[PDB]
């Protein structure tokens, strides 16, 4: 259930705005019919994987920044 | 000028004005400073304590080397901090009396090894006539005997007693002290959990469901704490399911039966209790009671290292001598068949011949003979004479006397040879790195020789490792009320075990000119 | 009288205590055996001389102790190269397990120990040797300075440990000091004798040497 999802989340602990942005990543099927898989669509951790490397390159090749930090 | 006029208090301070160094908070390097109790100043040099620090160190720079040694220092300090709040604590006379005896332990129960060699020599005495014993020096020391064996199995049950009074408590210690931190840190029983293997991790979760679980480890806190830290990232209330006269029924049973459970696994009280059964079983005979005499290989460090020796190689060792049992074996597959007629006992002639014809006694043949008989198994058997497997049978009996004698015997003998350079070697390691590096810092020798005697200095006006015990034994009996802020940043982090603390390439020296 | 023997005897001495302390210990399992002989195995004991009228059976249990260290320590081949062999008795199956855990526990391994102790004695005595010359070879004996800052001049080392601290050298001081009237010191000379006096010691050189000093 979407309203209950919310309060299950806690358990994984990720804002509930943001469980509800996530509900709706997921198709929302009926009153609530979210099949887990399209929830595995979220791919885009090509993107997450540059952005670590970026930030760590800079975290370290740019050392006592403390906006960075 | 102002402090050589100061000298008179300073002086009398100085056992006891302890100080370390900490990377605290501003990232250089503080030097606090702290009292020490003149008991501390006292409890740590005696006894056990200064050889246990020196099983330490040779469990650390044999062992560790690495980000444990600065983790597992702490974790030889809670132990041996524990172990002050022993001696510390040493019906009314019951506890007097208890106490008595577990700090005795070490004199009694040496005492106790004293009537195994008293008995034994008394025992020395026995011959068959029905078992009997001739007592030519007197008439009433055969009763001695049995007041000896009385009086020894009287020290064999006080003895473990009084185990169970001290080293027990520190070995149900450090068992809780690597429990709580699991559930405070690893989570495992919240997460991770141990399967049929490592058993004695499965055999902790009985204790955590226990209200009395923290009782060794000077924090009650440990239960409240790890629902705090975990029960948030996925259930609350199911974690505090898995925690939380009149004295008949006050005791809780699967804490203590969980300590029993611990204090089995011990090593040092099943040897007690083992070292007590035959003390029990001396009076219903007592040739069963000479097994005390082994006691002497613990008794006494002189053996034990000598001993352990043989046991540190083994594993190794052990596998060899079955390689041996193996290797026969090859032999006398190689004798039941082809050489099979030479095998002979034969007394007078023919009548009374004992051919090894069964083999699984041919095998047994040679182990009692050819393993032993130091010439090699051609020694006792018919010496082969015009016969064509005569020249194959001195092959059977060099290679028989090489492989066997010649290399597994002296394998054997060797492994153990080695040995002593092996637990040698390792001796001078400790002692080539406390002669070099500090054990803390790291810096190392070299760097402080530029200072006039100096490295010496390091390791006792500075880090000297046995402040930084008497520092934890300083915030650990300190209100957390009444803290520096220097020494809060300590007891801070010490309790999310980050160790940070612990200075790291930088000393006092280090940090400044 | 000769160092020769006397460095192999020293080594012998060198590690003597663990030694002697194991071959108590072998006394101690060989009466451990003994104590298992006397018992159940007791039959098997023999000097039987033509027949039964002249036997030995070690019944008294000190002689029969006395009998596995005259013997079984010595034998060679273990206990059951000088017994009564086993052939017929169940106890043949227990008697042989009696000779091969005495065979492997006394001569193949207590035996082995003291023999090895002689080993690690040598290369123990060879190791301490050997620290003696590397420290030698490096580091100097009083500054601690080592040899690897006194390489940076030409030669180097070797002259300070000559034409500098060269150990001797404070001995022919010291003999100097006390060959000479406490009227006559120098400056120097004469603090080096108070220090000298007072067990101070700071005299000296630590860290610092002439060169260390100096650029
Ligand atoms: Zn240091
Ligand atoms: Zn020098």
């Known amino acids: 259930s979407k309203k209950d999802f919310q309060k299950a989340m806690d358990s994984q602990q990720f804002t509930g705005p943001e469980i509800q942005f996530l509900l709706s990543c997921s198709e929302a099927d009926e009153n609530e019919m979210i099949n887990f898989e399209e929830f595995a669509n979220r791919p885009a951790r090509d993107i997450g994987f540059n952005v670590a490397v970026l930030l760590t390159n800079l975290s370290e090749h740019v050392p006592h920044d403390p906006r960075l930090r | 000028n102002f402090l050589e006029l100061a000298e008179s208090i300073l002086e009398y301070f100085r056992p006891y004005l302890g100080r370390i160094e900490i990377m605290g908070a501003s990232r250089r390097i503080e030097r606090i400073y702290f009292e020490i109790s003149e008991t501390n100043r006292a409890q740590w040099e005696m006894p056990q304590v200064k050889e246990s620090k020196r099983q330490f160190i040779f469990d650390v720079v044999n062992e560790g080397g690495e980000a444990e040694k600065m983790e597992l220092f702490v974790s030889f300090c809670e132990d041996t901090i524990f172990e002050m709040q022993i001696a510390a604590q040493i019906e009314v006379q019951r506890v007097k009396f208890l106490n008595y005896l577990s700090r005795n332990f070490y004199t009694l129960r040496f005492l106790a090894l004293f009537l195994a060699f008293a008995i034994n020599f008394i025992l020395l005495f026995y011959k068959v006539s029905v078992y009997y014993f001739l007592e030519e020096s007197t008439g009433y020391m055969e009763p001695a005997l049995w007041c000896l064996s009385l009086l020894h199995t009287l020290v064999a049950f006080l003895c473990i007693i009084g185990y169970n ?17 699991k559930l405070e840190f690893d989570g495992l029983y919240i997460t991770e959990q ?308 612990f200075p790291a390439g930088d000393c006092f020296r280090k940090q400044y000119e």
């Open chain 2, 165 to 181: 009074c001290l080293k027990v408590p520190l070995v149900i210690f450090k068992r809780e002290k690597e429990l709580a931190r």
């Open chain 2, 194 to 501: 141990p399967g049929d293997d490592d058993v004695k991790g499965q055999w902790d979760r009985l204790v955590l469901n226990t209200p009395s679980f923290p009782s060794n480890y000077w924090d009650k806190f440990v239960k409240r704490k790890v629902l705090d830290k975990h029960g948030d990232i996925f259930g609350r209330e199911r974690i505090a399911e898995l925690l939380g006269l009149t004295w008949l029924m006050s005791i809780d049973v699967k804490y203590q039966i969980w300590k029993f459970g611990v204090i089995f696994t011990d090593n040092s009280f099943l040897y007690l209790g083992w070292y007590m059964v035959m003390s029990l079983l001396g009076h219903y005979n007592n040739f069963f009671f000479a097994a005390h005499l082994l006691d002497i290989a613990m008794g006494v460090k002189t053996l034990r290292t000598i001993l352990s020796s043989v046991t540190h190689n083994g594993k190794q060792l052990v596998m060899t001598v079955g390689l041996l049992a193996v290797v026969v074996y090859l032999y006398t597959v190689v004798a039941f068949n082809f050489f099979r007629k030479f095998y002979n006992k034969s007394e007078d002639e023919d009548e009374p011949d004992m051919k090894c014809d069964d083999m699984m006694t041919c095998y047994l043949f040679h182990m009692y003979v050819g393993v032993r008989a130091g010439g090699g198994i051609g020694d006792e058997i018919e010496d082969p004479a015009g016969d064509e497997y005569e020249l194959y049978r001195v092959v059977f009996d060099i290679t028989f006397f090489f492989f066997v004698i010649v290399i597994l015997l002296a394998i054997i003998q060797g492994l153990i040879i080695d040995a002593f350079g092996e637990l040698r070697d390792q001796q001078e390691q400790v002692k080539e790195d406390m002669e070099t590096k500090c054990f803390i810092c790291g810096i190392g020798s070299d760097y402080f020789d530029t200072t006039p005697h100096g490295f010496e200095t390091h390791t006792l006006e500075e880090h000297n490792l046995a402040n930084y015990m008497f520092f934890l034994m300083y915030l650990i009996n300190k209100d957390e009320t009444e803290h520096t802020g220097q020494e809060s940043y300590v007891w801070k982090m010490y309790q999310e075990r980050c160790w940070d603390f």
